[model samples]
Target chain A: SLFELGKMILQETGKNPAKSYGAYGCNCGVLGRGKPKDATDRCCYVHKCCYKKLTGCNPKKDRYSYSWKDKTIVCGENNSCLKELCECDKAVAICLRENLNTYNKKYRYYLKPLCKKADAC
Target chain B: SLFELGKMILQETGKNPAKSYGAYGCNCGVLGRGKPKDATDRCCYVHKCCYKKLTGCNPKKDRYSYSWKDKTIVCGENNSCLKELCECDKAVAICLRENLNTYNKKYRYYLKPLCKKADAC
Candidate 1:
């Protein structure tokens, strides 16, 4: 499973391999317009960094996927790609779990724009 | 986002385009030992067929991905591959929703092994 591999990768690496990540700090969504407004969004920030590190793990795919929603998904052309995606999500879940309280209270759609479109990242 | 592309693909193709798929009818999981025990499994079967059609959409990846679990995920190398995977999962969700009744009651792990390791697909 992609997740099992992720778990194994997590165990093996003991950390996200991407050294220089999270600079955006959850500046993501819809061409990178979504800003981190809570711990969940914070999780997304880490997830975005994970994607940049992993490469090809699309935020859109994550939003409407079985893993994201409630469905069973299959793999595509690159097992490694999917594995990286799985790992990214796993990392975010861990992050969210750590900051559950802040997330529940602060959850809200960010309004004031600090990033330019397309160049949001 | 990969999912928007999937929804677009689903709208455009209007069907699974892999030509010859679903022969296994959800005969997948861990080297294909898993059987279609119910509609949920049936969704998996269709998802498996979707993967075969899409290629590189690993069942293992699906099992462990953020798409399968609850978390944010990003994209990787082949956007097309991820797009295909997103479509496969999208189609399966449609199937599962269509058969929500049978899935709730008949869920069970199929015991009899009909496939071998690695060649499970």
Candidate 2:
């Protein structure tokens, strides 16, 4: 099940899979959309990475460059993003951060990091 | 399916089932726990009620008595909670608000209104 898979991925990544805001956005769907993204999904895991960076970067001025504005890429609204479904929040940060990695070779350089941070979360 | 059922209930109640945190806690499971609660679940729907009240009451000093600390009843954290699961984030607010109703007679007067306010959502 996607739910089970999401939990598994969360365990491996050391990130919370439950519904959260501020960094990952809404866990379920938002504004009457769809289900939350399964943590097992690649983009889901990537969102977790961004969340960690966001948490770590906060209270620090220059540790990371990701800002609330950048978070809007994955998060549809100014401050919140929906989880699970492919509709709203996507892996914009990870896609851009891994642009140079051969494994994620496609769309390299073309994609922009949703959360612009020096360190990939 | 629980997901579909959840969506239906959400539509009827006019609540966003996607992930929200200020009032309804995490939409999915928290940490490495279970799946998000289907909005169709009785308690799930009730959570929406609390969320509405919370949203309406906010930004006012005395219009509503609910606060972020009280939000923990539905949201586990001081400022957030998990969604969907029958775990941490339970229907504490709604349970207490509807305690006096005959249909919800059981536990009437026993449960504390998680988010204390004059008007129930």
Candidate 3:
């Protein structure tokens, strides 16, 4: 997590929200961690926002899905919020796959402090 | 562009390109013309540096590639630089697509002489 945060601190320093480092830090937990740890984490943050920003999509019902196994995007209406969410997740997933290296690399350093925070559990 | 530039600045500013900044909005440009020239263009800057900072980032060539669609990097490489580009580019495309609605907030102001040569163009 710290690795992703560190990466975010390195990748995007200026724009946010509409162009943030990862609005909730990409932790994807209750309240999210600090800021996004990396570019991939930022994607998750955007994906997180896509739900609230779209306002009309019911992703909890699986309106749009990206099957990681086969890399397929099963979306909804052509011009609906569902479509947006589908693409949003798709983008995030693509981002994640793209940044897998940093994701894994920083993950090592993250575990250093990760346990410090995980101990909070 | 964002990533590449960040990568450069990582070397330029001693490796902390992703420092603290606003991190929101798609309305930051210069005088006379919209700073980014194109909204998606803004995403490029951030993705540019994503690679340099990390000994990470590289491949995920397509899946609806935008600027890099036909221009896929077909090296089938092993160098870290390879995935580094992918990670950053993939992250940026997500940012650009998320900003599809960023037209109304017209960025018709800001001084653009800060523009550099074709490399950054």
Candidate with top DockQ is: 2
Tell me the lDDT of candidate 2: 0.28
Candidate order (TM-score): 1, 3, 2
TM-score of chain A of each: 0.46, 0.21, 0.51
Candidate 2 per-residue lDDT over residues B24-92, each given as its tens digit: 322221111112223322343444443443432221121111223433332222222223321212343
Write one digit per residue (lDDT tens) for candidate 1, span A29-119.
3224344655556566666666766555453233222232232222233456666666565565456545544544223323325433322
> After superposition on all CA atoms, how large is the RMSD of candidate 2?
17.6
Residue by residue across B1-121, what tens digits does model 1's lDDT show?
3334233223333432111111222342222324565665566565666667655554334422223223222223345666667656556645654554554322222222332222245
DockQ for the candidates, in order = 0.03, 0.04, 0.01
Worst 10-residue stretch by lDDT in candidate 2 chain A?
Answer: A25-34
Expressed as tens digits, the lDDT of each residue in B1-121 for candidate 3 is 3334333333322323333111212212111112354554465445543534654433322221223345332323335565455455455545544554653223322222333322432
Give a tens-digit lDDT track for model 3, residues A69-98: 343434444756656766665555556556
For model 2 chain B, give the 10-residue run with minimal summed lDDT.
Answer: B25-34
